[PDB]
Amino acid sequence: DVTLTLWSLDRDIQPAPNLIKEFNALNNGIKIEYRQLQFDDVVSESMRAYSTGNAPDIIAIDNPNHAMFASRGAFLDVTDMIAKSDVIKTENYFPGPLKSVTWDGKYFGVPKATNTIALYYNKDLFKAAGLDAAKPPQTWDELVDAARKLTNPAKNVYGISFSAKANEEGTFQFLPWAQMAGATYKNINTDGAVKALETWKTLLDEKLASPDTLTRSQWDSTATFNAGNAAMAISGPWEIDRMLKDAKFDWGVTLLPVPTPDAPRSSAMGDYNWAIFSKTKHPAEAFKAIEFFASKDKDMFKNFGQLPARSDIPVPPTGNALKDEALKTFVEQLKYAQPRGPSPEWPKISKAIQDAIQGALSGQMTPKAALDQAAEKIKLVD
Template identity: 35%
Template sequence: MSRLLRTPRLRRPAARPGALAALAAAGALTLAACGTGTGAGGSGGAPDTLTEIDYYDAAPQNTQLPQILDECAAQNGVKVKHQQVPRAQFMPKLLQQASARTLPDLALVDNPDLQQLAATGGLVSLSKAGLGTDGLYPSIVQAGQYEGQTYGIAPGVNGLALYYNTDLLTQAGIEPPTTWAELTTAAKKLTKGPRYGLAFSAVGTEEGTFQFEPFFWTAGASLKQLDSPQAVKALTLWKDLVDAGSASKSVVTWTQADVNDQFMAQNAAMMVNGPWQLPTLNADKKLHFGVVPIPIPDAGAKPVTPLGGEVWTVGHSNPAREAKAVAVVTCLLGKDESAKWSKDAGYIPSNQQAAAQLGAADPQLAAFVAEVGTARARTTELGTGYPKVSQALADAVQAALAGGTSPASALSQAQRAAKN
């Protein structure tokens, strides 16, 4: 029987990372001469309105963000003028504004893009502005740093875990897998007719790299050496799953939203995906599912997942505007506000106490909360060099899964591309 695929809905996941091609095209803007303009808000005394920009175009983020922003703005005696820009245009626009010193007062930026934006000199150092980070996960604080200074802070983050269809696993007599060996066995046993055992996104962008990194890092691989034995081991796992028919060859074209569609249609018994999918999944009352941490190579290891989500930044303008903007960010990072934002958006609070409370109250989020403590900021190893290496890694995954190249050869090519 042919494996019929459900046509994916045209929507974007909350934490869809990447748009690296757009960033590369815009990179030259960071070299432009920088003036001493007054920023988006103009000059003068204390403002009554701050400007804000983000790329959210899907519920619940786009509906909840303005409300929480307005609440924090009101507490600090200002209003916020909200602007939403399509994701592909977002970083090119910000980089151009940074070069001209006209950045908005507030911007919500995908965390791996933060260092590139901070390198322009257009952002306020939140460290020097006195913004405290006590109680936040250290890995989350690190994700917003550039050259030892904090330029962005996430109110909440997301990551990846393994979703499984409880009905299908029960019928097959399978427990949720915890190791790679168990994952391989379960995926093979659950593959039947038009249904694959496992679905993941191996699309050739940052989104595909984001999905591969939990396996890559948990194996002990480093982005500084893409062709290490540990990296080959991780890519071999994915290739073996596809070659065995336990995962579809179409994973090289599936986004995370497409993967979710396959899972909801029961074309996949398990999937790798993030907490932002939970509102959609829970809306289907006929779908019964559970969530566990990403399987590990061997018992005793800890999953190392990439931190997804966005950080709040403050653009340079004048002292009065900057102070108000920092005050609004401080409010957004508060325990209650962080918990509210995360619950609405399908994220994990950056505040450790709020995250623990959320994980205890919501079993569906417990796996994601458990992983935050060992999660890794994507720019930790390479800083502003991350985008180039990320694309090289995505290309290697594509070459191995779709191009017939061995994992070792694909990763060797990736390592050469990353060094050029």
């Protein structure tokens, strides 16, 4: 056999290792060895691997990081193999995910999946609070007020869970709030972004969200919602299949609340892309693996609760009512997602935003000063 190696963050529950086991069972003369990426310095580790000759054949890379690798020659130009393939057609893909694998008029990967974040809510806790579980909050004011009502320390319940972690988690979570209020990563210090960050300060200062929001991932925050310790959670569709098993209450999912009545919806485009490292010894076989993964996209939601990056395969209902309502909400919120970049310097942009969030939420800097600082850094890097 040709043996390939593949790196991804995906858990044993999530697509990559399962798709690999299925692929390997084909006995087609190619075998894939999986390694789950550890430690949250994926980008630097993977570039260092590439530079030293330790890179895998295939990686699932977060979409905002793609351009850094593509621009630096680390990824194989798959333009011609995509063209030749009938399994992978660029016309099948949503435009934002497709653009994220592109650099200088070439394709340097194939989208794996797409997502964004939305607002999960525990309908049983809404009901017990005297709220209307059919009417979740629509505006930031409503969201904060609901969170105040639902915060019940005597019962170990925070009103909301989210992530402000000093890595991509925090940037991905914060950008929707800034964007809805009129800002972007290219202009992150508008009055509306300050209001967004003041709103996050309210959630922490008033103890409506755990202090651990400053250091905890979206996945680990949402575990607290699933256990009944947070009444609402901002997270993505990657939570659904675990939530169905773990949450022992009735729940819904709605669009992210907007800053003033009828202000616009917005959020950041999530999820990963497949890529082949440029010095692979097995380019054709690596690409055939990716073709196999793409051929399973039609089953991704039903099997993993994740969403393909494709307009050719609109996602059908599963038959599970909670999951199917979640699907509706995420498909709707996805219509408002915006790309982080393209930028070969995304990590530096994101670090500036992370530091602003940490500075304001810790009380070390005012929200205005924190975001002004970020905007000056971003001007230089971007």
